[PDB]
Paper text:
Natural competence is the term used to describe the uptake of “naked” extracellular DNA by bacteria; it plays a significant role in horizontal genetic exchange. Previous work on [name] [name] by Friedrich et al. identified a locus containing five open reading frames (ORFs) associated with natural competence. Four ORFs (pilA1 to pilA4 [pilA1-4]) were type IVa pilin-like genes, and a fifth, comZ, encoded an unusual and much larger protein that lacked some of the sequence features characteristic of pilin genes. Mutation of pilA1-3 and comZ leads to a loss of natural competence, although piliation is maintained.
Unlike ComZ, each ORF was positively identified as a type IV pilin by PilFind. [name] adopts a type IV pilin fold, a single α-helix packed against four antiparallel β-strands, with a small subdomain inserted between the end of the first α-helix and the beginning of the fourth β-strand, consisting of three short antiparallel β-strands and a short α-helix, linked by an extensive loop region. Although all three related pilin structures share the same fold, the subdomain is consistently absent. ComZ binds specifically to the competence-associated pilin [name]. The ComZ/[name] complex eluted in a single peak (∼80 kDa), at a higher apparent mass than ComZ alone (∼60 kDa); the complex peak contained both proteins (lower). Specific binding of the two proteins was confirmed by isothermal titration calorimetry (ITC), which gave a stoichiometry of 1.1 and an equilibrium binding constant (Kd) of 0.69 μM. Our model for the ComZ/[name] complex underscores this point by locating [name] such that its smaller subdomain sits between the ComZ pilin and β-solenoid domains, suggesting that ComZ could effectively cap the end of the competence pilus fiber. Virtually no reduction in DNA mobility was recorded in the presence of [name] alone.
Author numbering:
A (entry chain A): 32 to 202
B (entry chain B): 30 to 202
Write the structure that this text describes.
Amino acid sequence: RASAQARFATDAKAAAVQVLERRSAEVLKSEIVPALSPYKDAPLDPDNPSGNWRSFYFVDYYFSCPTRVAPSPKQRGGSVANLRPGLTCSGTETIFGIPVAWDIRGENGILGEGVVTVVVTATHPRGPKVTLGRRVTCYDVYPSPTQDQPAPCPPPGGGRPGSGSWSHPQF
Amino acid sequence: NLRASAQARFATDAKAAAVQVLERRSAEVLKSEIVPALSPYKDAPLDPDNPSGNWRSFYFVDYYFSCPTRVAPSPKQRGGSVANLRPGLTCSGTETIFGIPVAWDIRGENGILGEGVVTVVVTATHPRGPKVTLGRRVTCYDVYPSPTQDQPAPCPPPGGGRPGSGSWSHPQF
């Protein structure tokens, strides 16, 4: 009985991992785009802005999820019109009959600047649940941001506005 | 483009190291052992009609109340005493996996939201650059056998977890 539950738990974890891996890879994806693309983030050659640029999906997920926020003028022209429209922030995948809830979101406030979390929960039909997360920062894309070339990191104060929370045991 | 390939491989390796450590530390949180009725670490009797028989002990309780600092449980769990939490657990540390340091931390969460929740968080930092941070959230409901109404262990009673730490966050600050 212990054995059977342990097997279901192992499977729930494997289902969780496969969704966490795929959704995290989306956050870290980049693409080469022309200088006319609204989704450009950094030029391949800083001395040739008329040439190709790299575009990081990190920026699209960070500012779109769970709700759309305009970036600072330093990223995507400060406009939500220049975030990719095709994206899904959350959902449920079924992996060998195991439902896995998943969510991608940017963090907010100064602490959340340039951070995206990916969180999954697999709920095995026979009981066991497994919840996994991955924390991705703007520094984790390739190539690495530098002082001179900060994208896809936002400038200070250029992330998602702080949502606010006041917790206390007295409450 | 060489560098891109190399860094992707190092990132894959960093992820594998993080997973290994996350699995080992999460398994520790979920571990149980059979103990006699006289054990200070007893949580639930194996037979609900025979408390004189053997008991199950959940390490979940030890990690939840010991990490990152030791807090006394409520009188319903471990006799309400830090003396009845297992000594010599490690809450945090660094493991090196094929030359990749992995920071790891187990802790109970606090306040009403944190009641009966333990997090396990790891960060693998590849010497050549790539970092990978993974977490697992474990609740008292995830042990085997599952807690029930008539047998809640290792879940604390309402108000019987780690006291809330407090945090006042606001963009005005």
